[PDB]
Design a protein around this ligand. Structure first.
Ligand SMILES: *[C@@H]1O[C@H](CO)[C@@H](O[C@@H]2O[C@H](CO)[C@@H](O)[C@H](O)[C@H]2NC(C)=O)[C@H](O)[C@H]1NC(C)=O
Lengths: 50, 50
């Protein structure tokens, strides 16, 4: 049976805040399709042909 | 068939008579009189646009 992720009790209380001391600049790659091959088919030559 | 017949570098085995593309399409032949292998390429076609 699959595990959805590590469990984490967030350390919440009504007067505690966590502030980041430091950072990392992250570069992430996203790929997106934009076009197909522009195929076109002659219906008479496909069906019959000569 | 109908096509532009041309000389070719293909080496059929001694019993083989036709050659086929991935898409079944016959793309070479052996002449039964002088046992050379000919490529078949289709006669030129395409849309005409004004
Ligand atoms: C079919 O006949 C031809 C003609 O005899 C054979 O081709 C060669 O023809 C030349 C003359 O132009 C002869 O000098 C050769 O001896 C012939 N034979 C060869 C092997 O070159 C052809 O080989 C014959 N094909 C078959 C499958 O029998």
């Amino acid at each position: 049976t699959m595990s959805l992720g590590a469990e984490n009790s967030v350390a919440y209380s009504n007067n505690s805040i966590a502030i980041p001391i430091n950072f990392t600049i992250s570069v992430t790659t996203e790929i997106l399709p934009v076009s197909m091959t522009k195929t076109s088919v002659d219906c008479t030559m496909y069906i019959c042909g000569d | 068939g109908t096509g532009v017949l041309t000389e070719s570098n293909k080496k059929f085995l001694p019993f083989q008579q036709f050659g086929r593309d991935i898409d079944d399409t016959t793309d070479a032949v052996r002449d039964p009189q002088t046992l050379e292998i000919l490529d078949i390429t289709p006669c030129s076609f395409g849309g005409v646009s004004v």
